[PDB]
Amino acid sequence: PVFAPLKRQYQLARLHEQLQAATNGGRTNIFKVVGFG
Amino acid sequence: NIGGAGSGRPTYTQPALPKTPAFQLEGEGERVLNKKKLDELVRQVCGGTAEGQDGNMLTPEVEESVLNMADAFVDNVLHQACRNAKERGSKVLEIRDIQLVLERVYNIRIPGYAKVQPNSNWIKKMSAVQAAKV
Amino acid sequence: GPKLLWNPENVRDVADALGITLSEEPLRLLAQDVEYRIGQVIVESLRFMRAANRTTLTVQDVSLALRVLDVEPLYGYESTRPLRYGEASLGPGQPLFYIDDEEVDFEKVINAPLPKVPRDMTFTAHWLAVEGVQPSIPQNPTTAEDLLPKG
Amino acid sequence: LKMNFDLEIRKRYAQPLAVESGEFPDTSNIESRMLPFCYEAGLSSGHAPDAAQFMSIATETFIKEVMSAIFSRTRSNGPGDSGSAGFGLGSGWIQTHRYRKQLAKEEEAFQRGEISRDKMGLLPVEAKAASERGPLGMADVRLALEMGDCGLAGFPVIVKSVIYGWREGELENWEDYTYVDPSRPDGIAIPS
Amino acid sequence: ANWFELCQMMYVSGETGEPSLETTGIIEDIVRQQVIEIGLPWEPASFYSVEVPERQRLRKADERTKAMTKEEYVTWSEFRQASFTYRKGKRFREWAGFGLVTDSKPSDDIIDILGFLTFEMVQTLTEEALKIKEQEDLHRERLTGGGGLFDPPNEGRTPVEPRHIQEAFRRLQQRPKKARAMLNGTKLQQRTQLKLF
Amino acid sequence: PLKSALENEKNLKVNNRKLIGHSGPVYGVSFSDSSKLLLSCSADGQIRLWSLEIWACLCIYKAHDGPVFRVLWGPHGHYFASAGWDKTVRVFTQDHASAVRIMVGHDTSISALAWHPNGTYVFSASDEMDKSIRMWSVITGNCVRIFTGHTHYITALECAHNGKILASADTGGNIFIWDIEKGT
Amino acid sequence: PPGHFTAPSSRLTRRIDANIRQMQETRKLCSKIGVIIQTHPFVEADIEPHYISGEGPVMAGEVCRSALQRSVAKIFYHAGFEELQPSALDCITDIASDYFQKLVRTFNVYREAEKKPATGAAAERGARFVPRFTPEEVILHTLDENGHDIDSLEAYARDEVERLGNKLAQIHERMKGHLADLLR
Amino acid sequence: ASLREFLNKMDDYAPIIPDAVTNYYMTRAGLPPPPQTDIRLARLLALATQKFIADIAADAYQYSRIRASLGIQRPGYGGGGQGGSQNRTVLTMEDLGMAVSEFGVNVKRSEFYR
Amino acid sequence: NLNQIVTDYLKKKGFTRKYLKAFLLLKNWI
């Protein structure tokens, strides 16, 4: 086994869930850029 | 309330006698008791506090350590207990698994909730060794 | 599964001591785990041995290795007495070995003389080589007894 | 047909941790955490009704044992055993000769009615001794972890966090120094 | 079972209130667990092959005894005789599971010793729980006028609670540091057997 | 005879002395840049600073978790480095009780150390599965070079005086000579 | 100096030798009664003259371990044993060595703890930090952590051995009387 | 009792452990020898060691005596030869293991190695 | 091939292609 703090695991899980919700499972690319700013 | 749809939704929708939701008319509130719990434990183990001072028995850095300890303990104990319960063919989690884990891994005994012998081959081997020694 | 250096018969004897009957699968698993633990202990002991600029393994290195791994210490293995094994015969081709231990009286142990005290630590000096040549003095090895390329 | 066991396990991360909120875990939080753990292991039925309270009691016992272990190795002159205070039949602290003498004298005097206890039941000597003690710091924890495990053998992360942190009281006095001086008794010159 | 015996023992030790059923149950489980878990051969005369013929509890108890009425004294004396095994051998054996863990039908001296020990355990538990409850109340301390027809005259006294008994049990399980001095400087967990307080 | 600055030990006649205070086997020692200071480390996880004028300890450093195997002064004697069982390299200054830099990146225990002649770089080597040498920057604390090729336990490391060559040896009898700038 | 490898002389080592001698004599009497065998007194050997350079302890593990084993054997004979298995003796000797080292390390741990801020009269005088354990507290904690107390040690060293000696003398008198009456 | 009076009386409470062993093990543990450390402290430490060993010895003897008078030794305490001589009490591995199990030590071995 | 991996990684990362000293020294030389 490998050991690490619980806070990091919980935060990473929450962030991954939010990202999966936002990107609709990778079917939408919210990071695209159009033009030249 | 069973079904999984949810409760309290103000939309367009029953048993004969539903159960009354919990409530508290007036008092300290859980937000204060939960925060005072740690100070209460410290007072309990510290022996006693003199008049005119209380609450500040741990520095800010030690309280975080204690809370982390509590979280880790809960998580580890539950994770071990659930797998142990599933091992023996059960489909539900009972207090016996938690008690076994607590006793055999942490040396903790909570009251109020309800052998080996050698076989013949070992005896024969010991008899042979003893006969050889004499 | 893989090939095991640890014979499952030792695990079988250990189980027999506790009045337990084992199938083949748990027996093999226990043998594999014991083998892995032995390997871990050997690695740690060799690490501690190399840290001290030595090539001789002692009991102290093994004890330190066991300490770093959080294993309960073993006591009584630092004795200066010789180690002798007996030999029992459970049958044709099935020998057993046991440690030789004879009861002794307290008089013999208490009255025995102490070992000899070695001399104190000290250091000397001499010339191992002068201008690339080794002098033939008592402090250097004899020419009678790999130090020169011949390609 | 089928039950989606992957929709309830994800609920574990919704509730905040004890460190995040500052609330000691209680029956409600443990009950909330129980179900995802059961579903992960394959316990379809769930858990017994009266397990959350058992878990809460166990957690309180564990924390109390740890904290008592730490306190015993760094404190002395605790309340006496005359009555209603002290450690009773548990393991107590050490005592000093002068404190013991004064405590015995006060205990003898109280039997004659000359002296009375305070509001919390402590005699003048016990209250005076308890007044001086300050809060628990990280130096005490570090010292207590050198003697033994203090019940934290199964939590290497906590111990490593204690060991790898800054020394207590170091960030504040970041520019306090001493000097080497063999003429001084200890070889150290303390600037005043 | 043994609920009323427990009540009498608590009363003798100083608990004059009316403890609920939970406290009695917890005490019963503790006592049952202890009982299930449960010159002289090692005297100096054993060093030789051939032997030859020869030739605060008290203070509180006294204060209470001085502070009781005649009826209270009679009740105290009658309750002092409470026992687990006095003329209850078959019931005690069934309750303690003698057959399942030992050869059946032990002598009566064993039963008398067990009764004595059980009385001691109950006394100790009550005495410690009372102190814990008193300290909790003392720390905690620091609107209906008129009156009805059934309200109590003065009240004010309450029995002990399961949490107090649990705290007392936690206190009674700690062992001396001598049993741990050999683990100093290491990270080894201490694992032992149930302590017979 | 050795001399002590203590007046009570005026003109004592002894040519060897003892430094006591470690509770475990001592694995490293280092004389400071005559030398007045000494460093030592042991299996108990501590680093001790001794005085060669009064022959007594002055400070203890408690940053490690497990045995410490090697300790080395800097090329000019104010900084020192250490490395042991927990797979980390730490750089200290004698004025501070906590390590000023922490260097992560090795996968196994450290078995060798070395400083650069200019006092701003450090070398380290690991054993077992990860037999590699690394060069760290003291300003940032990052790795800047990796050397691979060793097949045996690495026992010694050394850096040339000109500052452009590095030498290393293992238990197979081999000695490697590395170019620092090209990593070849 | 001579006697370095032998037990000191005090009121405690005496009365222990006396208890052992009384035990041996009464065992001889019991053997005679049973017949109706012989032993010799315990004597501790010493070492040949030894010289040391400078000033320091004699670091010889074998001799020290042998002397410790001799002491342990004497104690275990005082406890009432007559024969022994070598492996058990080796085990208990190892345990004794480990306990001694643990005790000394505890003393050192408590003596060299981090200081604490001064307060009260100490702060008024201008001092900033003071030791967090007084010399008495250090010793008391060292004894406590290892399961000892002043009262227990005093009682053991003052009363237990004397009581055992009195009991042994009474037993010897009774045995002598019984043998004499049997002879008559 | 007081620490000062006890240390002053330490003259009459010297243990049986020779000073050489005390110095050797103090040096191993990290404490200088008596010349730099009051001899009374070293004597006190040695006396504590003696008391600890005597307690273990008494426990072992008590364990041995209750056994004296099914009837098969417990596994894991291998040792012995013929079995001693006469009706003398023999300090064997079993009693020592049982006694030290109360102090947190484990001395389990194997009886036959094969 | 390691070269291919390194080149791919680099491309994907947008990598474009005073007097007292003198007196003492003089005295010591003298």
Add this chain to the structure above:
Amino acid sequence: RPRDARTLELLLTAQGVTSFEPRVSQLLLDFAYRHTAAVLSDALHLSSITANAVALAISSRLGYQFRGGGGGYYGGGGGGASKDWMLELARERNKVALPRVLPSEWGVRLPGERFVLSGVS
């Protein structure tokens, strides 16, 4: 000489050890015995016992010991800490500026009075 003692000695010899001490192999054998007994007892208490019980017992035991070995990439050796957590700690530490020193204090300054052995006699 028992069996597997010669095998352990041969294994040690085949790895560079040119000398030993008589008693090492006995220590290793007794350690193996004790480990087997402990694991067997744990498995028996867990549940005839299956392989799942043995695996669960080993997994439970691995929670408080055997946190070492020669593990490499993402192997739980040298304490068992994760590389990401150590990297975070290193990033936090390596952010501060190096101490300022002058030529007149280079080699003579020491930590504060709270972290030095002053007055321990």
Add this chain to the structure above:
Amino acid sequence: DHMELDPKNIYEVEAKILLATYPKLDLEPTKNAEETIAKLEKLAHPEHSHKPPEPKVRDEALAAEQERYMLTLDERLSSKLWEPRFERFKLIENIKQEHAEKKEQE
């Protein structure tokens, strides 16, 4: 091969990346402590020159009580006294698309 990078080549790949990133170093020896001090001062980095952190630290009542009383037994609003994600809508959209696509074949 399968995987894009076998672990055993990680050290070599990292070494080559490091070689490409830091092509020039400062390998000039110093002769005394002052030179080392000057070199340390000159090479300071903005991202590694911060300061040590700071120690960690820890009338209307009647209206609030009236509101709390008036919200008695309210299942959902009482607890609060909200981050929408539209997960059910997205699930419905996905299922509808899958059903339509499958119907395309038939």
